[PDB]
Amino acid sequence: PNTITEENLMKMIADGRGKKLVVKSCKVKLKLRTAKYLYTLTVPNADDAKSIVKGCKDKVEVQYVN
Amino acid sequence: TANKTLSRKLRLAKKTKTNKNIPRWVIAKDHLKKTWNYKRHHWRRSHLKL
Amino acid sequence: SKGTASFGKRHTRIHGSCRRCGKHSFHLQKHECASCGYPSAKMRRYNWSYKSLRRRTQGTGSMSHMRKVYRAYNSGTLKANARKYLA
Amino acid sequence: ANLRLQKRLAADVLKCGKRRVRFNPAHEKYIEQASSREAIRSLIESKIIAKLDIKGSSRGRIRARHAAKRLGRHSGHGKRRGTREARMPSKTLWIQR
RNA sequence: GCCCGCCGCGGUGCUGACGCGCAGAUCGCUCGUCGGAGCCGGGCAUGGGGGCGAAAGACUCAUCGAACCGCCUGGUAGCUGG
RNA sequence: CCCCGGAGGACUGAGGGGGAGACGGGUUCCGCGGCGCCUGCAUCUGGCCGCGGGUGACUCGGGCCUAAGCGGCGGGUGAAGACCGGGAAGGGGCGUGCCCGCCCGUCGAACGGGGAGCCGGCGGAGACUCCGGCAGGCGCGGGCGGAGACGCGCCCCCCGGCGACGCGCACGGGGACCGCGGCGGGCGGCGCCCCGGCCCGCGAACGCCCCGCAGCCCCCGGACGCCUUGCGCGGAGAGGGGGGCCCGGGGGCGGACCGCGCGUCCCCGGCCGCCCCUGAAAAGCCGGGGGGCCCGCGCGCCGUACCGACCGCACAGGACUCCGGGGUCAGCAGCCUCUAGCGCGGGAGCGAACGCGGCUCAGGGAAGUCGGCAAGCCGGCUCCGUAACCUCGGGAAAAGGAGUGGCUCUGACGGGGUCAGAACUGGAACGGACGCGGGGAUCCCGACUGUUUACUAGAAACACAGCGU
RNA sequence: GGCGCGGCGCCCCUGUACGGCGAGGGCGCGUUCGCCCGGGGGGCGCGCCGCAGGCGCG
Ligand SMILES: [K+]
Ligand SMILES: [K+]
Ligand SMILES: [K+]
Ligand SMILES: [K+]
Ligand SMILES: [K+]
Ligand SMILES: [K+]
Ligand SMILES: [K+]
Ligand SMILES: [K+]
Ligand SMILES: [K+]
Ligand SMILES: [K+]
Ligand SMILES: [K+]
Ligand SMILES: [K+]
Ligand SMILES: [K+]
Ligand SMILES: [K+]
Ligand SMILES: [K+]
Ligand SMILES: [K+]
Ligand SMILES: [K+]
Ligand SMILES: [K+]
Ligand SMILES: [K+]
Ligand SMILES: [K+]
Ligand SMILES: [K+]
Ligand SMILES: [K+]
Ligand SMILES: [K+]
Ligand SMILES: [K+]
Ligand SMILES: [K+]
Ligand SMILES: [K+]
Ligand SMILES: [K+]
Ligand SMILES: [K+]
Ligand SMILES: [K+]
Ligand SMILES: [K+]
Ligand SMILES: [K+]
Ligand SMILES: [K+]
Ligand SMILES: [K+]
Ligand SMILES: [K+]
Ligand SMILES: [K+]
Ligand SMILES: [K+]
Ligand SMILES: [K+]
Ligand SMILES: [K+]
Ligand SMILES: [K+]
Ligand SMILES: [K+]
Ligand SMILES: [K+]
Ligand SMILES: [K+]
Ligand SMILES: [K+]
Ligand SMILES: [K+]
Ligand SMILES: [K+]
Ligand SMILES: [Mg+2]
Ligand SMILES: [Mg+2]
Ligand SMILES: [Mg+2]
Ligand SMILES: [Mg+2]
Ligand SMILES: [Mg+2]
Ligand SMILES: [Mg+2]
Ligand SMILES: [Mg+2]
Ligand SMILES: [Mg+2]
Ligand SMILES: [Mg+2]
Ligand SMILES: [Mg+2]
Ligand SMILES: [Mg+2]
Ligand SMILES: [Mg+2]
Ligand SMILES: [Mg+2]
Ligand SMILES: [Mg+2]
Ligand SMILES: [Mg+2]
Ligand SMILES: [Mg+2]
Ligand SMILES: [Mg+2]
Ligand SMILES: [Mg+2]
């Protein structure tokens, strides 16, 4: 498991390296499940909004707060 | 022992498998009065050397 | 303490199962059987113990091949087959 | 009537020794009818089965004697068993200086 | 290859207990030693007139001033019993 | 009911009557049922009896490597069985046809070497093996920067490296443990006191960034210094200033409550000391010189239950190794204890002799006895004070004296205890249990530490360094 | 020989109970002290009274 900067995150998205994304509410955690590692990014909700506006439609995103 | 070869395992397994009594229908069928299988054994007083 | 106490120091196997004769007689350190003499090519036999001889010999097992061959000779067609061959 | 099975199953769920698991004297007929960790879990729910807390050893007297010892009490020649070097090695003091 | 002393390793005295035993060598108190020629485990080597021995004729599977197993062997007895 | 439950009273006492492995045992394991046998008393109990069940691996071990050894080798020898052995035309790459080559074992370690695993959960009985999550290993398929120390595809011959190593009193660092307070949550008792008692407050492997004492190296320059508990180091280049590399570790982000201390155990570090003692090997993996040239799929075979249920004809004997809290204390001693666990061929009554294990005894004090055998006296810590003789190291705790509790204070050392001193007080007491030398004057033997008749002899016997042939 | 159990008093043994109040070297704390207090506790001897006391065999 490891942490990632958002532009590398979009590289991963745009070259189809992820199988599922998770949004965790708490500062929001974005969790990306790739072949090798699980990558995590932490952004405020304002930035989560635009990252998901930019989210991929070949990409299953699932929400989570509890 | 917890670390035993397969050959010793198999011979021990056969002793365990055959340590049994005569069936009652066998007693009726063969018309027996002796009903104890005297080749049985018990772990406390046995010296299986296998 | 050469008796009962010394008996409590026994947790070794001296002999194990023989691959040829099947008895608890194969010496695990010398690698040689004390009953049938394996791995020698010939079997261990001694005339000073005929009870040891009778315990394991020809006839105490199945005799499967020899049994069939003898009945074939004594009453079957084997000597006729011998005549046909030896013509 | 024989409830050794439930006692071992209960200590397993509560993660405690069998000596610190207590059954309600009544409602016992129920404990006999349980044979799984699942049925026992419901009994720990209804509260028919519970675990006693550990009983440590009070340190009130020990904390008092230590307070008095930091005031100079209980530390004369009648109270010393080991030698001065065993109590305060000379090399430790030399290294500090 | 120092001294007191724990576990360990050993085995002094009570000529204590026991001695139809808990036990075909044990138990209690006391006692020697405890950084060393120290103690322990597994694997391996040496075979009977042979081995091995800081040497007691000690030890070599409850057997040792010559192990154990089967045979020679129903060994011989001017001697004891019937 | 000696079984089960609740309540009480105790014990084992972290070198455990606790929790787990190796060997040996072999189903003793689990659930349901039961009492014919056994469970030296009983039993509704059970390791007993009947019926069903039960041990899942790329990552743990075995398989591989080699140790001390053992076997094999054209042959050699002997009446043989068999025993002994280098002097033998001893095999590989490929791709035809060339090229390289002196000659063994896929025997021998379930503790040595050896690529790679952590957390949470689920079952009557299995788990580093199942399930979920997160990783790691080995495989197979679609020529540049720096002043420098240094930083950022293969194949053969030769030169190297890792693997790969003793003991020790100290000193230092990390981890775990342990304590003292704060704060949050929950208990218990409560005749008086009580913000003073008890329980719970948890963070893995793995990936990225930073940080790491000692130690070794680079640049400048050229010297009465640097420095440890101890040492040690310097014109073969110190100190000072600036850098590089290693460091079983720590932190931050991922994975996913807050401080402050003495000490213990384990591992690690740099030194120093010791030896007529100098403290394995190999597979496997890699470097140098010279020369020639991301995404998918998989990981086979065997062990895995339980037990001091093992050996002593069944048993106070014998039987290797892990983990190791609190108080008193020099402490892994003795004594009490939290956690955990709770059998040991059965009970009741009486309170004779005698015995076995213990206790106390006026006055005397070895008169007892072969013989002070047995028992008793002494014993911790601090201070005082200590002879003959001697191989000058010892004798030595020689012999002998004095103090020691509780409470209220004071001083010294840079939060932490130790050491020193004073006043008051108690049957004229204080190492208040526990733990714990009696001493001296001599003679004989052997120098000394060590060894021995397992089961009647531990010695003056054996050994020993030294000496000699 | 209708016992005893359980009390009450005497007499002995030990040595002045808990608590309360008021002296104490010292810095609200304080070991210890005095008074209530030859007190409190205890009894297997002595004396007198609630519960009780005279059983089946032969
Ligand atoms: K097993
Ligand atoms: K057995
Ligand atoms: K013995
Ligand atoms: K043999
Ligand atoms: K202090
Ligand atoms: K000892
Ligand atoms: K003796
Ligand atoms: K006696
Ligand atoms: K003994
Ligand atoms: K010593
Ligand atoms: K020899
Ligand atoms: K031998
Ligand atoms: K002999
Ligand atoms: K002989
Ligand atoms: K014979
Ligand atoms: K013969
Ligand atoms: K003879
Ligand atoms: K004769
Ligand atoms: K004779
Ligand atoms: K006779
Ligand atoms: K049953
Ligand atoms: K010949
Ligand atoms: K020969
Ligand atoms: K092999
Ligand atoms: K080997
Ligand atoms: K080994
Ligand atoms: K191995
Ligand atoms: K090695
Ligand atoms: K080179
Ligand atoms: K298992
Ligand atoms: K009596
Ligand atoms: K008598
Ligand atoms: K005398
Ligand atoms: K006399
Ligand atoms: K004596
Ligand atoms: K003395
Ligand atoms: K004092
Ligand atoms: K001697
Ligand atoms: K010594
Ligand atoms: K001696
Ligand atoms: K003797
Ligand atoms: K002796
Ligand atoms: K001696
Ligand atoms: K002597
Ligand atoms: K001797
Ligand atoms: Mg052997
Ligand atoms: Mg010193
Ligand atoms: Mg010594
Ligand atoms: Mg000594
Ligand atoms: Mg005759
Ligand atoms: Mg004869
Ligand atoms: Mg106790
Ligand atoms: Mg069972
Ligand atoms: Mg019985
Ligand atoms: Mg491995
Ligand atoms: Mg290994
Ligand atoms: Mg298990
Ligand atoms: Mg090694
Ligand atoms: Mg297991
Ligand atoms: Mg006399
Ligand atoms: Mg001597
Ligand atoms: Mg003897
Ligand atoms: Mg009074």
Coordinates of N, CA, C and O (backbone and C1' of nucleotides) in Angstrom, one line a residue, chain F residues 323-370:
Chain F
rC323 P 13.5 -18.2 25.9 O5' 12.1 -17.6 26.4 C5' 11.3 -16.8 25.4 C4' 9.9 -16.6 26.0 C3' 9.9 -16.0 27.4 O3' 9.9 -14.6 27.4 C1' 8.3 -17.8 27.2
rG324 P 10.9 -13.9 28.4 O5' 10.2 -14.2 29.9 C5' 9.0 -13.4 30.2 C4' 8.5 -13.8 31.6 C3' 9.5 -13.4 32.7 O3' 8.7 -13.0 33.9 C1' 9.2 -15.8 32.7
rG325 P 9.5 -11.9 34.8 O5' 8.2 -11.0 35.3 C5' 7.8 -9.9 34.5 C4' 6.5 -9.4 35.0 C3' 6.4 -8.8 36.4 O3' 6.8 -7.4 36.4 C1' 4.6 -10.3 36.2
rG326 P 7.7 -7.1 37.6 O5' 6.8 -7.1 38.9 C5' 5.7 -6.1 39.0 C4' 4.9 -6.2 40.3 C3' 5.8 -6.0 41.5 O3' 5.9 -4.6 41.8 C1' 4.4 -7.9 41.8
rG327 P 7.3 -4.3 42.6 O5' 7.0 -4.9 44.1 C5' 6.0 -4.3 44.9 C4' 6.0 -4.9 46.3 C3' 7.3 -4.9 47.0 O3' 7.7 -3.7 47.6 C1' 6.2 -7.0 47.2
rU328 P 9.2 -3.4 47.7 O5' 9.8 -4.4 48.8 C5' 9.4 -4.2 50.2 C4' 10.1 -5.3 51.0 C3' 11.6 -5.5 50.9 O3' 12.3 -4.5 51.8 C1' 10.6 -7.6 50.7
rC329 P 13.5 -3.7 51.2 O5' 14.5 -4.8 50.7 C5' 15.3 -5.6 51.6 C4' 16.0 -6.7 50.9 C3' 17.0 -6.3 49.9 O3' 18.3 -5.8 50.4 C1' 15.7 -8.0 49.1
rA330 P 19.1 -4.7 49.7 O5' 20.0 -5.5 48.6 C5' 20.6 -4.8 47.5 C4' 21.3 -5.8 46.6 C3' 20.4 -6.9 46.0 O3' 19.8 -6.4 44.8 C1' 22.4 -7.8 46.9
rG331 P 18.2 -6.7 44.5 O5' 18.2 -8.1 43.9 C5' 19.1 -8.5 42.9 C4' 19.3 -10.0 42.7 C3' 18.0 -10.8 42.5 O3' 18.3 -11.8 41.5 C1' 19.2 -11.6 44.4
rC332 P 17.5 -11.7 40.1 O5' 16.9 -13.2 39.9 C5' 15.5 -13.4 40.0 C4' 15.2 -14.9 40.1 C3' 16.1 -15.7 41.1 O3' 15.4 -16.7 41.7 C1' 16.4 -16.6 39.0
rA333 P 15.0 -16.7 43.3 O5' 16.4 -16.9 44.1 C5' 17.0 -18.2 44.1 C4' 17.4 -18.5 45.5 C3' 16.3 -18.7 46.5 O3' 15.8 -20.0 46.4 C1' 17.9 -17.3 47.4
rG334 P 14.2 -20.3 46.7 O5' 14.0 -19.8 48.2 C5' 14.3 -20.7 49.3 C4' 14.0 -20.1 50.6 C3' 12.5 -19.7 50.8 O3' 11.8 -20.8 51.3 C1' 13.8 -17.8 51.3
rC335 P 10.2 -21.0 51.0 O5' 9.5 -19.7 51.6 C5' 9.2 -19.6 53.0 C4' 8.5 -18.3 53.3 C3' 7.3 -18.0 52.5 O3' 6.1 -18.7 52.9 C1' 8.7 -16.1 52.5
rC336 P 5.0 -19.0 51.8 O5' 4.3 -17.7 51.5 C5' 3.4 -17.1 52.4 C4' 2.9 -15.8 51.9 C3' 2.1 -15.7 50.6 O3' 0.8 -16.2 50.7 C1' 3.7 -14.0 50.7
rU337 P 0.3 -16.9 49.4 O5' 0.3 -15.7 48.3 C5' -0.9 -14.8 48.2 C4' -0.7 -13.7 47.3 C3' -1.1 -13.9 45.8 O3' -2.5 -13.6 45.6 C1' 1.1 -13.0 45.9
rC338 P -3.2 -14.3 44.4 O5' -2.9 -13.3 43.2 C5' -3.8 -12.1 43.1 C4' -3.6 -11.4 41.7 C3' -4.0 -12.2 40.5 O3' -5.4 -12.1 40.2 C1' -1.9 -11.3 40.2
rU339 P -6.2 -13.3 39.6 O5' -5.4 -13.5 38.2 C5' -5.6 -12.7 37.1 C4' -4.7 -13.0 35.9 C3' -4.9 -14.4 35.3 O3' -6.0 -14.5 34.4 C1' -2.6 -14.1 35.7
rA340 P -7.1 -15.6 34.5 O5' -6.3 -17.0 34.3 C5' -5.9 -17.3 33.0 C4' -5.0 -18.6 33.0 C3' -5.6 -19.8 33.6 O3' -6.4 -20.5 32.7 C1' -3.4 -19.5 34.5
rG341 P -7.6 -21.5 33.3 O5' -6.8 -22.7 34.1 C5' -5.9 -23.6 33.5 C4' -5.2 -24.5 34.5 C3' -6.1 -25.3 35.3 O3' -6.5 -26.5 34.6 C1' -4.4 -24.3 36.7
rC342 P -7.8 -27.4 35.2 O5' -7.1 -28.4 36.1 C5' -7.7 -28.9 37.3 C4' -6.9 -28.7 38.5 C3' -7.5 -29.2 39.8 O3' -7.2 -30.5 40.0 C1' -6.6 -27.0 40.1
rG343 P -8.3 -31.6 40.6 O5' -7.6 -33.0 40.3 C5' -6.4 -33.1 39.5 C4' -5.3 -33.8 40.2 C3' -5.4 -35.4 40.0 O3' -4.0 -35.8 40.1 C1' -5.4 -34.8 42.3
rC344 P -3.6 -37.3 39.6 O5' -3.5 -38.1 41.0 C5' -2.8 -37.4 42.1 C4' -2.9 -38.3 43.3 C3' -4.2 -38.5 44.0 O3' -4.4 -39.8 44.5 C1' -2.8 -37.3 45.5
rG345 P -5.0 -40.9 43.5 O5' -5.6 -42.0 44.5 C5' -4.9 -43.3 44.6 C4' -5.8 -44.3 45.2 C3' -5.7 -44.4 46.7 O3' -6.7 -43.5 47.3 C1' -5.3 -46.5 45.9
rG346 P -6.4 -42.8 48.7 O5' -7.9 -42.3 49.2 C5' -8.9 -41.8 48.3 C4' -10.2 -41.9 48.9 C3' -10.5 -41.3 50.3 O3' -10.5 -39.9 50.2 C1' -11.5 -43.4 50.2
rG347 P -10.1 -39.1 51.5 O5' -11.4 -38.8 52.3 C5' -11.6 -39.0 53.7 C4' -12.9 -39.5 54.0 C3' -13.3 -39.5 55.5 O3' -13.7 -38.2 55.9 C1' -13.8 -41.6 54.7
rA348 P -13.0 -37.5 57.2 O5' -13.8 -38.1 58.5 C5' -15.2 -37.9 58.6 C4' -15.8 -38.9 59.6 C3' -15.3 -38.9 61.0 O3' -15.8 -37.9 61.8 C1' -15.4 -41.1 60.2
rG349 P -14.9 -37.1 62.9 O5' -14.9 -38.1 64.2 C5' -16.0 -38.6 64.7 C4' -15.8 -39.8 65.6 C3' -14.8 -39.7 66.7 O3' -15.5 -39.0 67.9 C1' -14.4 -41.7 65.6
rC350 P -14.6 -38.4 69.1 O5' -13.7 -39.6 69.6 C5' -13.7 -40.0 70.9 C4' -12.5 -41.0 71.2 C3' -11.3 -40.3 71.8 O3' -11.3 -40.3 73.2 C1' -10.7 -41.7 69.9
rG351 P -11.1 -38.9 73.9 O5' -9.5 -39.0 74.3 C5' -8.9 -40.2 74.4 C4' -7.5 -40.1 73.8 C3' -6.6 -39.0 74.2 O3' -5.2 -39.4 74.3 C1' -6.9 -38.9 71.9
rA352 P -4.5 -39.8 75.7 O5' -3.5 -40.9 75.3 C5' -3.9 -42.2 74.8 C4' -3.4 -43.3 75.7 C3' -2.0 -43.8 75.4 O3' -1.0 -43.0 76.0 C1' -3.4 -45.6 75.5
rA353 P 0.5 -42.8 75.4 O5' 1.2 -44.3 75.6 C5' 1.7 -44.7 76.8 C4' 2.2 -46.1 76.7 C3' 3.5 -46.3 75.8 O3' 4.7 -46.1 76.6 C1' 1.8 -47.8 75.1
rC354 P 5.7 -45.1 76.0 O5' 6.2 -45.7 74.6 C5' 6.8 -47.1 74.7 C4' 6.8 -47.6 73.2 C3' 7.4 -46.7 72.2 O3' 8.8 -46.9 72.1 C1' 5.3 -47.5 71.4
rG355 P 9.6 -45.5 71.9 O5' 9.5 -45.3 70.3 C5' 10.1 -46.3 69.5 C4' 9.4 -46.3 68.1 C3' 9.8 -45.1 67.2 O3' 10.9 -45.5 66.3 C1' 7.5 -45.5 67.1
rC356 P 11.9 -44.2 66.1 O5' 11.1 -43.4 65.0 C5' 11.3 -43.7 63.6 C4' 10.5 -42.8 62.7 C3' 10.9 -41.3 62.8 O3' 12.0 -41.0 61.9 C1' 8.5 -41.5 63.0
rG357 P 12.9 -39.8 62.2 O5' 12.0 -38.5 62.1 C5' 11.8 -37.9 60.8 C4' 10.9 -36.7 60.9 C3' 11.4 -35.6 61.8 O3' 12.4 -34.8 61.2 C1' 9.0 -36.0 62.1
rG358 P 13.3 -33.8 62.0 O5' 12.3 -32.7 62.6 C5' 12.3 -32.3 63.9 C4' 11.1 -31.5 64.3 C3' 11.2 -30.6 65.5 O3' 12.0 -29.4 65.3 C1' 9.2 -31.7 65.5
rC359 P 12.9 -28.9 66.5 O5' 11.9 -28.4 67.6 C5' 11.1 -27.3 67.4 C4' 10.3 -27.0 68.7 C3' 11.2 -26.8 70.0 O3' 11.8 -25.6 70.1 C1' 9.3 -28.1 70.5
rU360 P 13.2 -25.5 70.9 O5' 12.8 -25.3 72.4 C5' 11.8 -24.4 72.7 C4' 11.2 -24.8 74.1 C3' 12.3 -25.0 75.2 O3' 12.8 -23.8 75.7 C1' 10.6 -26.6 75.4
rC361 P 14.1 -23.8 76.6 O5' 13.6 -24.3 78.0 C5' 14.4 -24.6 79.1 C4' 13.8 -25.6 80.0 C3' 14.8 -26.4 80.8 O3' 15.3 -25.7 82.0 C1' 13.1 -27.8 80.0
rA362 P 16.8 -25.1 82.1 O5' 16.9 -24.5 83.5 C5' 15.8 -23.8 84.1 C4' 15.6 -24.0 85.6 C3' 16.9 -24.1 86.3 O3' 17.4 -22.9 86.8 C1' 15.5 -25.9 86.9
rG363 P 18.9 -22.3 86.3 O5' 19.9 -23.2 87.0 C5' 20.1 -23.2 88.5 C4' 20.8 -24.4 89.0 C3' 22.1 -24.8 88.3 O3' 23.2 -23.9 88.6 C1' 20.9 -26.7 88.7
rG364 P 24.1 -23.5 87.3 O5' 25.0 -24.9 87.0 C5' 25.8 -25.4 88.1 C4' 26.2 -26.8 87.7 C3' 27.1 -26.9 86.5 O3' 28.5 -26.6 86.8 C1' 25.5 -28.7 86.5
rG365 P 29.3 -25.9 85.6 O5' 29.3 -27.0 84.4 C5' 30.0 -28.3 84.6 C4' 29.8 -29.1 83.4 C3' 30.5 -28.7 82.1 O3' 30.8 -29.8 81.2 C1' 28.2 -28.6 81.7
rA366 P 32.3 -30.1 80.9 O5' 32.2 -31.5 80.3 C5' 31.9 -32.7 81.0 C4' 31.9 -33.9 80.2 C3' 33.2 -34.0 79.3 O3' 33.5 -35.4 79.1 C1' 31.2 -34.1 78.0
rA367 P 34.6 -36.1 80.1 O5' 33.8 -36.2 81.5 C5' 34.3 -37.2 82.5 C4' 33.2 -37.5 83.4 C3' 32.0 -38.4 82.8 O3' 32.3 -39.8 82.9 C1' 31.2 -36.6 84.2
rG368 P 32.4 -40.5 81.5 O5' 31.0 -40.3 80.9 C5' 29.8 -40.9 81.5 C4' 28.7 -41.0 80.4 C3' 29.0 -41.9 79.2 O3' 28.7 -43.3 79.5 C1' 28.2 -39.8 78.5
rU369 P 29.8 -44.4 79.3 O5' 30.1 -44.4 77.8 C5' 29.1 -44.8 76.8 C4' 29.5 -44.4 75.4 C3' 30.9 -44.9 74.9 O3' 30.9 -46.2 74.5 C1' 30.7 -42.5 74.5
rC370 P 32.1 -47.2 74.9 O5' 33.3 -46.8 74.0 C5' 34.6 -47.2 74.3 C4' 35.6 -46.7 73.2 C3' 35.6 -45.3 73.0 O3' 36.3 -44.5 73.9 C1' 35.5 -46.5 70.9

